[PDB]
Write a protein that binds this ligand. Sequence first.
Ligand code: ADP
Ligand code: BEF
Ligand code: MG
Lengths: 615, 65
Amino acid sequence: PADFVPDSVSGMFRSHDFSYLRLRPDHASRPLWISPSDGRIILESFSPLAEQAQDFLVTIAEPISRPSHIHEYKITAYSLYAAVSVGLETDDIISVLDRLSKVPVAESIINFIKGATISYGKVKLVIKHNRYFVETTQADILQMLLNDSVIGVHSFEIANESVEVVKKRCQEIDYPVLEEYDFRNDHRNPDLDIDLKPSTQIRPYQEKSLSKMFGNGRARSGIIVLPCGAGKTLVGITAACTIKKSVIVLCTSSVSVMQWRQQFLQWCTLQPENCAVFTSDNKEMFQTESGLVVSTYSMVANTRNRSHDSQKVMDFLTGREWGFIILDEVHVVPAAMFRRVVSTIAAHAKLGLTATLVREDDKIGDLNFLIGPKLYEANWMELSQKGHIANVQCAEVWCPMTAEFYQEYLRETARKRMLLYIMNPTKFQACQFLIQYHERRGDKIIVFSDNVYALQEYALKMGKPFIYGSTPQQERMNILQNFQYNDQINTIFLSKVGDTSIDLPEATCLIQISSHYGSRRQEAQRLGRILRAKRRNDEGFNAFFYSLVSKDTQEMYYSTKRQAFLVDQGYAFKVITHLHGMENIPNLAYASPRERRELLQEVLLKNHPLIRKMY
Amino acid sequence: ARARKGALVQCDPSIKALILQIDAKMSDIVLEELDDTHLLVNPSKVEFVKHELNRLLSKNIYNPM
Ligand SMILES: Nc1ncnc2c1ncn2[C@@H]1O[C@H](COP(=O)(O)OP(=O)(O)O)[C@@H](O)[C@H]1O
Ligand code: BEF
Ligand SMILES: [Mg+2]
């Protein structure tokens, strides 16, 4: 910024006027705009070299939003740490950035890349016989690590529990640690001979994801983010198949444990002998040299009360030095005690698999040192147009509450306010009319409702099956099987239980009467259920995703906040003020005033052997 | 036949509750009730109530930041 006359409209831009720089004549070809201060990147998706830089930019810059035409990216310290890992130096980044940037890379941006791109590659953490050694390739690091107030060719031991502390210390200090596993030269750990059968097929986007993880030839530790239904299960299977070592899978559900094992058996060639499932039902552990354990975070994260049956398994897990760990739905690993499994379980490589990499609290960034940086992220829109995932016509239906109910809405306290507007009569009519309309079309409908009481009320009146936490595994499976293979039943009423890692290929339509406040991942994960549509390639097919919201209620504040992640991905929500043909439906719930008042009162009222013969 | 100065407010049933609730705490707001979707209010309070209603309605609308 030297000798540049401000414009009369420069006042409107509060220090954001970046016109001080000039533009080269080759602006017609260069597809990258760079903000000299904020680090933001604006990418043209309708210009030559778009595909040329679509992969280079993703590696260096994380995506904040990738709508149809103009893609938005931002460069951050964490993003650079991921990029520098895969054989990238400042010189290469600077040379390519200038070759592609319409506007010159400012000194501030140049300074930012220099600082964070030079630290990588001077400290490594290795594991030997369940003993963790902070090995360094140069002796100069001893004067920096051993003298650290937190800690405690040269190699020194470090406590397993202290790993969660030193890794954060590594981020704070200049040198961050990298977890690279040389499986090729690792012979001490017994190998597991498994390869994908010929029937298997590797999709290009998955192939790119695997390449980002096996770029240098040594297994990396990080996170792979793919849209729901992209096939993350096969990505984990391929990673397990190529490493050919002891592996384990952790999932935060019981039904999903069978799903992962079922996919594992069919895709790869692992024999049933080497696979053991550690759940509440069975706890036997494989005695063969090497195998797989598909367990849940609850079983491995428990510390206080472990019984004899589970205690023996825990000793077996801890005693042996494993090679790989798979964390399905890794967006819940940095929790208070779910993160303990990473440290307690010894493994030379860690993989994270979550469709959504966001959470309400600011602990999402902690995944960098719990499991590693972000390796690859796949755009939802690109896969959708390629026929790999289904298209969804997201809609938001506005249901104005009736006057009688709204009268109690103002007075009622917030705690009971939720229950008040969740069972408003208008939403019943919309849900019933939409369900009937889609049932006539021949659509498999899934109804989600976080509130158990509302879920029961909907099902009891509508005479449709409902599933919630109290139901057993056998009953829910029977309901699920009936909903899939039987033509008689085409709609089910699910709850928060099936919000994640559930495969419903036949599901095409989804309705959400009321859900979990401001949570965003719930909105996206639930949307992933209908992204599984088997008939996602037939012409004119469009999955339906509805979110009934009461007008003039806090649900609008929650609804607009929870769907803030889908808009970033690219999905757009349509407002439906009125449903055509809804009045001509023969019967509707609570049509007469008498029935409406009956509902209002009920919801308002909610809150010695000898002696034995005598008797 | 008395010309009672007031603003002829036409509103939906949802908004009607707000004006009634607003009148509950501040009695002077609503002069009289006309019908379910119609109301008569103090002409002076019209400027204040409209801004007051927006603040209450502003809460249920999310703001990105
Ligand atoms: N390459 C592939 N070949 C065959 N089916 C695939 C492939 N990739 C994904 N699928 C299918 O996609 C669906 C979802 O797979 P899954 O791994 O459970 O997805 P995610 O875990 O990402 O939600 C399943 O029906 C699975 O068989
Ligand atoms: F992301 Be998937 F639906 F497990
Ligand atoms: Mg999955």
